[PDB]
């Protein structure tokens, strides 16, 4: 952050945030290019993976900058352009979560995105280290949240909808559909089960049907379904909570 003995000082901490903003703008633009298209092709999907890797590394670097309650670095990121990048990532996460989940071919891209989201939330938590009551960092972070109100709401609804699935699949009223431990259940039984559970609205039910890949027998493995969706939700939502 500050080279005391040197005649000239360069803020590497701020430069890292500048690069993070520059790369998040490119990620948002590439998202907006792929938003209209129904499917993301292989080249775009790999470019997403490469950009997510770069952004994850930058987020880890910022987290290492700010941990060990480094108050100077925390104050520098507080006044830097980090909040705009966080808002952009929040928008991208809120929309790619709803888009990629429906498709069954971008599972790895969804996992990479969830890991990036987890690292962003870890960076925010490290910002909130050594916090004081009515501090400036908390005020700026809540301002960022209020600015990104809709995206956080969509992310939280996503997390709740995929966290209730563990209770749904552990319920006995769903367990009677699969009397054995084979764990393969039909889409018709799945739709009847979630409607009987009645903790899911119609929109949530149809979204969960869409998020489950269909085979020739119209049967799905709810074990792999829940292990794919619940656990990333149980981690990232815990960090957000």
Swiss-Prot record:
Channel activity is modulated by phosphorylation. Phosphorylation is increased in failing heart, leading to calcium leaks and increased cytoplasmic Ca(2+) levels. Detected in heart muscle (at protein level). Heart muscle, brain (cerebellum and hippocampus) and placenta. It is found in: Sarcoplasmic reticulum membrane. Induction: By TGFB1. It comes from the Eukaryota. Signal peptide: none annotated. The calcium release channel activity resides in the C-terminal region while the remaining part of the protein resides in the cytoplasm. Homotetramer. Can also form heterotetramers with RYR1 and RYR3. Interacts with FKBP1A and FKBP1B; these interactions may stabilize the channel in its closed state and prevent Ca(2+) leaks. Interacts with CALM and S100A1; these interactions regulate channel activity. Identified in a complex composed of RYR2, FKBP1B, PKA catalytic subunit, PRKAR2A, AKAP6, and the protein phosphatases PP2A and PP1. Interacts directly with FKBP1B, PKA, PP1 and PP2A. Interacts with SELENON. In cardiac muscles, identified in a complex, composed of FSD2, CMYA5 and RYR2. Belongs to the ryanodine receptor (TC 1.A.3.1) family. RYR2 subfamily. It is linked to Ventricular tachycardia, catecholaminergic polymorphic, 1, with or without atrial dysfunction and/or dilated cardiomyopathy: An arrhythmogenic disorder characterized by stress-induced, bidirectional ventricular tachycardia that may degenerate into cardiac arrest and cause sudden death. Patients present with recurrent syncope, seizures, or sudden death after physical activity or emotional stress. CPVT1 inheritance is autosomal dominant. Cytosolic calcium-activated calcium channel that mediates the release of Ca(2+) from the sarcoplasmic reticulum into the cytosol and thereby plays a key role in triggering cardiac muscle contraction. Aberrant channel activation can lead to cardiac arrhythmia. In cardiac myocytes, calcium release is triggered by increased Ca(2+) cytosolic levels due to activation of the L-type calcium channel CACNA1C. The calcium channel activity is modulated by formation of heterotetramers with RYR3. Required for cellular calcium ion homeostasis. Required for embryonic heart development. This is Ryanodine receptor 2. It comes from Homo sapiens. The chain holds residues 3859 to 4099 of 4967 of the full protein.
């Amino acid at each position: 952050r500050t080279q005391t003995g040197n005649n000239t000082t360069v803020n590497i901490i701020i430069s890292t945030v500048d690069y993070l903003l520059r790369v998040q703008e490119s990620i948002s633009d590439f998202y907006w290019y792929y938003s209209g298209k129904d499917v993301i092709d292989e080249q775009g999907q790999r470019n997403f993976s490469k950009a997510i890797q770069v952004a994850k590394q930058v987020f880890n670097t910022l987290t290492e900058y700010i941990q060990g309650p480094c108050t100077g670095n925390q104050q520098s990121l507080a006044h830097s352009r980090l909040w705009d990048a966080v808002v952009g990532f929040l928008h991208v996460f809120a929309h790619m979560q709803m888009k990629l989940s429906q498709d069954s071919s971008q599972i790895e891209l969804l996992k990479e995105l969830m890991d990036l989201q987890k690292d962003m939330v870890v960076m925010l938590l490290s910002m909130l280290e050594g916090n004081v009551v009515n501090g400036t960092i908390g005020k700026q972070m809540v301002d960022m949240l209020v600015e990104s109100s809709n995206n956080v709401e969509m992310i939280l609804k996503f997390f709740d909808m995929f966290l209730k699935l563990k209770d749904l699949t552990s319920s006995d009223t769903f367990k009677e559909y699969d009397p054995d431990g084979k764990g393969v259940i039909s889409k018709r039984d799945f739709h009847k089960a979630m409607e009987s559970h009645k903790h899911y609205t119609q929109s949530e039910t149809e979204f969960l049907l869409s998020c489950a890949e269909t085979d020739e027998n119209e049967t799905l493995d709810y074990e792999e379904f829940v292990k794919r969706f619940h656990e990333p939700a149980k981690d990232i939502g815990f960090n957000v909570a």
